[model samples]
Target: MALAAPPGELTLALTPDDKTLDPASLDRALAILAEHGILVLTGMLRTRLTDQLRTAMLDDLPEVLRQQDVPTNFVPGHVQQDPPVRESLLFPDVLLNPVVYQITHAVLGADARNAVYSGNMNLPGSHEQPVHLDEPHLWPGISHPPYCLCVDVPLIDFTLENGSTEYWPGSHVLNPDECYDERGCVLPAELERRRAVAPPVRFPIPVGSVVIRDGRLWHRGVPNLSAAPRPLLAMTHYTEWFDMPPIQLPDTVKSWVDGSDRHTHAHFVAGDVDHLTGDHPFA
Candidate 1:
């Protein structure tokens, strides 16, 4: 049987015995994703790893902001950041999990490749971000199929108090011209209209959970009313035909992905990655 989701919400919360979905579950997950544009898989990440990443990101965030020519914020108190690129932190479960690959390959085909590996931190007292699309249609006035998807791994339980991301389910299928402006932002009137038809929702997903969402879905960061920072790792996977800049990583870790089914668009450099100061979008 498929996992239960709250009424009127499309997010499915599933816990598989071995972190792998069964055939039926995989089909259900794909159906839900195709319709709602998001899926939440629990137990996909280990608690130990989650805790370690939380600590590492919290310890590095201050320096990351300080090193910036000007601090980069997706919105006030919501900072754009990157996860540590150390080999120790690049576990297969995170970078090459079978479950993730299964779904990505199904949605993006056999040639799916990951292009971005970064994160964002929602700090205490953060304000809500403007509703927007991360990957707008390649051409205006044309409705295109899904070309990119973002996989988010939260290090801490996401709750209303700590700013869980708000998503507009089913919005991914809306025509680009009707939903986004020339700048790719949702218009104020359209947001208000959409709210009345199908309001946005924030799912309080737990730590060690993975959220796979279509890139064109309408979403925005919510306020972090809690005292501590909430960090969420993000990776963008593109179809083979999609062109995107390659990510930089240390050559030593090349072996980690050498035999993986999913391809990683990465450039193996001889030295350190300088992840903190690396090039990031919207910085």
Candidate 2:
């Protein structure tokens, strides 16, 4: 049976027995992703795991805030942060989730690999970010297939009240040369034109759900009005030939990725990694 989803949103529920999507569901998912630039898969993550990740991120928030020249701030109170890279926090269900891999492979081909394993947080009092694209087209004047996809794993229930991301459906296919400025910012006039046709949207996404989106999609972070911070893990997977740096991983979890169907672009290092301060926009 197909999973229920709200209008304009495509969501599928993984089979409880093996946490996999059937062939038909998988095919439909790919079509939706191609058409809308996003899809959500539910029931792939265990509640316990999501709870553990949430707690760890909350504990590390103070330290992330204390760093000098906090470059994580994408907008006031909305910071791009990295999750702990310890073996204790890494799990196959997240890093090597088969359902996610299937969709990524279909979109990015057999050699798709992960490039970024960081996340962003929406803290209380945050303001809305300007609508933008994470990656611009390789050739601004021409249209092309997606080169990167972002897999989002929310640590807590993502509600509109707490600032769930607002997305522009089908925006990935827009001609970058015509719709975006030189710096990759969405042109205000173009945004208004698209707004009249389809408008942007934000909706609640439960914890333990995974959202996969195209990197070129037009999206922005909304304000968080709640008392607690909302953290969502973001992993970027790229086509095999995309030129990007590898993610850092501890040597202890090297075996975790051995012989996996999808390539994990990682460099395993010895000892601890200061994940909180390791990632910054400038660095």
Candidate 3:
């Protein structure tokens, strides 16, 4: 069994230099993800792209969130349901990084779909979110490949103080009785148990890096103690066999996927041009 790394032993690195991924690299990458539940690739997105995404996400998206609710003030101020960040991320270079698709293709099959498209903003002085999984296994006690893979692209550097995402490695394969709450969260006792053996890890990812993690991994968003908002764009690539909802892309982003391979992943429908909307925030 693969063991989680101690906090002192966590070491991250740049992605392989070759832009073209090979069979060997693909195998290695998949193994890392399967065993560790997270893989980081550097320089996947250009600096220019991240800069543009950051501006649109923080400056323009705040007003959109303010428009919605009888909302209570929260520590971690994030706007996940907002407009397509600059609409430029929909372009292949940002979302369709070669290593990203290669991993998704191998794990989810060549026809895997990209359905969840959103971003997370952990603002300065925000507190730690409760430890939880994005969702549970499709069935209990039955080992299977994950139905969904979450891809996170941080717009700025993720470090200890800026609320970098913290995850327990190899926890994706955790036993049902290990330390999970009946309410779909990882219990604090379980987190303590994991720490008793192996330490949870936080990535010090560079601005242009991408992190691909299992959807079932035990993780939580830490407080953002930095001066700037820490924004991470998120997407979910699900196995081809899973039932999927129609992908809602703003009409303005149509040109990005008009003649691309992403078009085959889902049934694209007319969506809000001004913003990406959602029902509620459970966290």
Candidate 4:
């Protein structure tokens, strides 16, 4: 079935707050997401958890880096892995952000999968990545709503020195032909053209805030010129119609997952999980 197009324009009235979201506010956030393909949830994470996560992630980084080999086409000075999240990194506040779940269900349906959990860290001297999307539209036209939404939770304040992600808003609705190559990445020619028109922006989104992004949006990882590493966690919600292989979950968190009531239907297989190693964005 063809997906409906969003209205021609949208203006957001409600900003995400830690308090319970009223029905009207939730609807407004969803509308802003649909119309612009991005939503910013400022201060969604609890304060203490952000620092706790950062300390633990940094301590564990040396081991994860040693175990996982960097993959091809990865930006220089980038290191990433599925963070070992059995403790502080596994807080319920960030994991169970109510607004994020609401947006996922409304956009991708009640059965959207929410199983992916991974972490990334960009070290000093990292180079910028080629512009790309985590996934492309299922078909060749702009007739369908996006098949996935990536939710990013930076463990530290994302500042210019640390190299915040470069985002091009509204690029999600552009024609598919101008948006992708054979491997489902944004084409360089297309990226240059789009940048000329809409120039990208890197907002200094605070630590603990979440950025919900359409999976098809045009974006890239900018270089981190600072001395310290930039660490962040990621989760994604996939539509019911999409087929994503189940990701392995840490045994410690398996019970939490089993007891959760989030509306997503993402598959989480529990096992002797291996540390994730790679060069590109975590999906």
Candidate number with greatest lDDT: 2
lDDT of 4 by residue, 93-164 (tens): 666667787778788877777757777788888898877777677777657777788988888888867878
Runs off by more than 4 Å, candidate 1: 1-19, 68-73, 176-178, 279-283
lDDT of 3 by residue, 223-268 (tens): 7888987888888888767776655554566665655554235334
Clash list (residue pairs), candidate 4: 113-266
Candidate 2, run of 10 with poorest lDDT: 1-10
Off by over 4 Å in 4: 1-19, 250-252, 263-272, 277-283
How far out, in Å, is residue 103 in model 1?
0.7
TM-score of 2: 0.93
Whole-model lDDT per candidate? 0.81, 0.82, 0.67, 0.69
- Residue-pair clashes per candidate, as listed? 0, 0, 0, 1
Ranking by TM-score: 2, 1, 4, 3
Q: Estimate each model's TM-score.
A: 0.91, 0.93, 0.82, 0.83
RMSD of each: 3.8, 3.5, 4.9, 6.4
For candidate 3, the lDDT comes to: 0.67
Candidate 1, pairs of clashing residues: none
The candidate that wins on TM-score is 2
Question: Over the full model, what C-alpha lDDT does candidate 1 score relative to the true structure?
Answer: 0.81
Residues 99-198 of candidate 2: C-alpha lDDT, one tens digit per residue: 8888898889989999888888889999888898888888867988999999999999888778888888899888745778765779999899888887
